[PDB]
Amino acid sequence: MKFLDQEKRRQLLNERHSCKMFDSHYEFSSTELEEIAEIARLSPSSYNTQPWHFVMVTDKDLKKQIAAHSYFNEEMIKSASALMVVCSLRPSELLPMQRLESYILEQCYIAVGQICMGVSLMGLDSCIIGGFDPLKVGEVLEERINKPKIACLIALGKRVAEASQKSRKSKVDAITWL
Amino acid sequence: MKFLDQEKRRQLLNERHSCKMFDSHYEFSSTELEEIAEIARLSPSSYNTQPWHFVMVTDKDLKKQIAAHSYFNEEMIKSASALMVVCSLSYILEQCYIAVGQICMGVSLMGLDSCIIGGFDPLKVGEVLEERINPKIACLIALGKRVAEASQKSRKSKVDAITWL
Ligand SMILES: Cc1cc2nc3c(=O)[nH]c(=O)nc-3n(C[C@H](O)[C@H](O)[C@H](O)COP(=O)(O)O)c2cc1C
Ligand SMILES: Cc1cc2nc3c(=O)[nH]c(=O)nc-3n(C[C@H](O)[C@H](O)[C@H](O)COP(=O)(O)O)c2cc1C
Secondary structure: OOOOHHHHHHEEEOOOOOOEEOOOOOOHHHHHHHHHHHHHHHHHHHHHHHOEEEEEOOOOHHHHHHOOHHHHHHHHHOOEEEEEEEOOOOOHHHHOOOHHHHHHHHHHHHHHHHHHHHHHHHHHEEEEEOOOOOOHHHHHHHOOOOEEEEEEEEEEEEOOOOOOOOOOOOOOHHHEEE | OOOOOOOHHHHHHHHHOOOEOOOOOOOOOOHHHHHHHHHHHHHHHHHHHHEOOOOOOHHHHHHHHOOOOOOHHHHHHHHHEEEEEEEEOOOHHHHHHHHHHHHHHHHHHOOEEEEEEOOOOOOHHHHOOOOOOOOOEEEEEEEOEEEOOOOOOOOOOOHEEEEOO
């Protein structure tokens, strides 16, 4: 019951890459945005806690304000069709270095791994972003939504340039066979 | 262009499910084993740090041992074709979980099945392995072939999960 053959499954692993620049002229349809939200939502988590909230930022000025405080990621964020803000839930909403906080981030990180695979399946591109001023991006999103704890960002869109070459430590360093 | 069309992308997200029991007859080829390991290795991380190590358990006797300490996951793990032990070497040491999500998606693309496992005793699971590896064990992933259909998706509302800006 496979979906893609070896050649295709291998290509996807390479197409899943950190897209450093996006086609600013490519706009996300409601269909594209909705499926991405479903890829995020349908992700797995321990005891199905789903301690995440995904904020889809498509407004250019609002994304631009976040971009201005993402340092070297500014032009990239600006270029992107959409910017996902992966928010971690409060521990008070979870229950009916901090242990609960780290647990929640672990679930959020899983979702991220699923999302970026989904984005490649559609034919689009992403870049996970942790290089940003956390206090400042919260600031410009405060009046819009309650002050969130941000795990990471995910820039989204269509690429202008080809995928960068994969650089990973040796199969030996990463894999033990038993 | 697309790798898969709309229907098949939507189908996959349901095929990507926590498989509770596996075909205890089915055995992983080397080719199946090697892809699963490469999906894991090509995962993304901060500054390409790759703060992880993946241990592939296939031997039925050693897997049987790990399953004995896996509480309510005992039969599942014994019946699986393989068992991956995911280990970590801001905060960056949690980013092995980014791999986890990529792996399970890649596994389902092959038309196989997986279950992410957090229900185990890390003391005794680490003990039976420590004659070889130096941990830190984050979680487990059972890998193999299903015996029945994928479970129904239960999730909180789209409204609970998504803010549209
Ligand atoms: C970190 C982690 C640990 C998990 N541990 C277990 C487990 O010990 N036992 C189990 O039955 N399921 C476990 N699961 C599976 C979740 O219960 C499952 O992801 C959730 O119910 C969503 O359903 P789905 O994966 O079938 O789509 C775990 C999932 C994650 C992400
Ligand atoms: C938590 C996290 C944060 C990241 N932040 C950035 C970033 O701020 N800027 C950037 O260009 N890439 C960022 N990346 C992408 C990684 O640098 C990239 O995944 C790694 O170099 C491997 O390359 P690849 O994904 O293209 O295979 C981030 C990745 C992760 C997991």
